[PDB]
Design an enzyme around this catalytic site. Sequence first.
Site, PDB file in Angstrom:
ATOM      1  N   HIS A  36       0.808  -1.206   0.000  1.00  0.00           N
ATOM      2  CA  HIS A  36       0.000   0.000   0.000  1.00  0.00           C
ATOM      3  C   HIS A  36       0.848   1.265   0.000  1.00  0.00           C
ATOM      4  CE1 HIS A  36       0.296  -0.047   4.545  1.00  0.00           C
ATOM      5  NE2 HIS A  36       0.283   1.262   4.348  1.00  0.00           N
ATOM      6  N   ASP A  63      -0.506  -7.448   1.000  1.00  0.00           N
ATOM      7  CA  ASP A  63       0.030  -6.103   1.210  1.00  0.00           C
ATOM      8  C   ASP A  63       1.558  -6.177   1.173  1.00  0.00           C
ATOM      9  OD1 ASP A  63       0.460  -3.450   1.650  1.00  0.00           O
ATOM     10  OD2 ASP A  63      -0.482  -3.356   3.652  1.00  0.00           O
ATOM     11  N   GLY A 141       2.787   5.648   9.210  1.00  0.00           N
ATOM     12  CA  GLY A 141       4.126   5.848   8.704  1.00  0.00           C
ATOM     13  C   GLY A 141       5.072   4.705   8.978  1.00  0.00           C
ATOM     14  N   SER A 143       4.258   1.730   8.351  1.00  0.00           N
ATOM     15  CA  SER A 143       3.958   0.764   7.326  1.00  0.00           C
ATOM     16  C   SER A 143       5.164   0.487   6.468  1.00  0.00           C
ATOM     17  CB  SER A 143       2.831   1.224   6.426  1.00  0.00           C
ATOM     18  OG  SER A 143       1.595   1.190   7.087  1.00  0.00           O
ATOM     19  N   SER A 159       1.845  -3.835   7.961  1.00  0.00           N
ATOM     20  CA  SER A 159       0.708  -3.535   7.083  1.00  0.00           C
ATOM     21  C   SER A 159      -0.228  -2.511   7.682  1.00  0.00           C
ATOM     22  CB  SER A 159      -0.047  -4.830   6.732  1.00  0.00           C
ATOM     23  OG  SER A 159      -1.208  -4.550   5.963  1.00  0.00           O
TER      24      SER A 159
END
EC number: 3.4.21.12
Length: 198
Positions: A36, A63, A141, A143, A159
């Site tokens: 993502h 993801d 952030g 992620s 994720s």
Amino acid sequence: ANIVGGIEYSINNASLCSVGFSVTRGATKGFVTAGHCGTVNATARIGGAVVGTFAARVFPGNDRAWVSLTSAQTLLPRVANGSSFVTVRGSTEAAVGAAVCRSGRTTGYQCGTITAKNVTANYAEGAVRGLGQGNACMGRGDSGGSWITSAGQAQGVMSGGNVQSNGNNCGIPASQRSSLFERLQPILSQYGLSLVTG
């Protein structure tokens, strides 16, 4: 740039995410991260300099992504822990109940335990299935960033999670946190990647 798990990078000079792990694909240098975080061909920057581009991604459903890097980048078998490092030693999958940590540009290095497997997240874009869950906190952030045991076994990439109005789930008890990671193993095989270890 030196490629270390947990550090910030930008995507198309817009969003920020965190590096997962240094990898190779034959002669090509790369890092894994969350899908993502970017679309195919999106430009990754670290310290204001272009470092590479998104080579492939699956999101939602999965993801996952990897960023192919220019040969000038320096791949390192490391994850940031404050001003120090956790060495990446392999990708053995830890069981539910194991201790685990994660690293990312918003909340830094946080530890907890693995609380579930095979979790579905219903994100705005669609469901993502098959996620690991831990109770280490995280925030917006983080992620893409590394999930790794203290013993250096890379677990996955960040994720999502049940962030609160302050943008993280660090202000609620561990018992209430759902912090979700994409397993590393299927990313590595999907894209033919080898983890850089030390």
